[PDB]
Write a protein that binds this ligand. Structure first.
Ligand code: 9UD
Length: 114
């Protein structure tokens, strides 16, 4: 099956908005990590493929996903980066785990619909 860009935007953007709606848990993920601003200069030594909500939103808006699993892969890349980099006790790690729970719930019926 071939997916049209607007078909993917209509189906998948509500699942991304559900992540943005999470406060405080989406706040670390709304913009690309800025290591110098945050004072964490080792970040890019650990995380080789950064990803965040704003970049996913732009990719959906500009038709960069041909198939829904590419979108799912980027959302999970964002999660995996945060579980890799941050300590298990940290806000960003526990907030990431919450976003993963919300995403799992939202994406499943959408994928069934296609
Ligand atoms: C996604 C990822 O891996 N980041 C790398 C580490 C990281 C990120 C962030 N970010 C990115 C910028 C926005 C932001 C906002 C919040 C927030 C929540 N509730 N409120 C009211 C605000 C939090 C959360 F912590 F309070 C973290 C971050 N900080 N950190 C480290 C946090 C500890 O000091 C060093 C920086 C993003």
């Amino acid at each position: 099956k071939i997916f049209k860009p607007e078909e993917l935007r209509q189906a998948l953007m509500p699942t991304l908005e559900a992540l943005y709606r999470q406060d405080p848990e989406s706040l670390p993920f709304r913009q690309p990590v800025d290591p110098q601003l945050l004072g964490i200069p080792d970040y890019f030594d650990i995380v080789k493929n950064p990803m965040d909500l704003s970049t996913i939103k732009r990719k959906l808006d500009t038709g960069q996903y041909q198939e829904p699993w590419q979108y799912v892969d980027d959302v999970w890349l964002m999660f995996n980066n945060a579980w890799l980099y941050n300590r298990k006790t940290s806000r960003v790690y526990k907030f990431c785990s919450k976003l993963a729970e919300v995403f799992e719930q939202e994406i499943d019926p959408v994928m069934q619909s296609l």
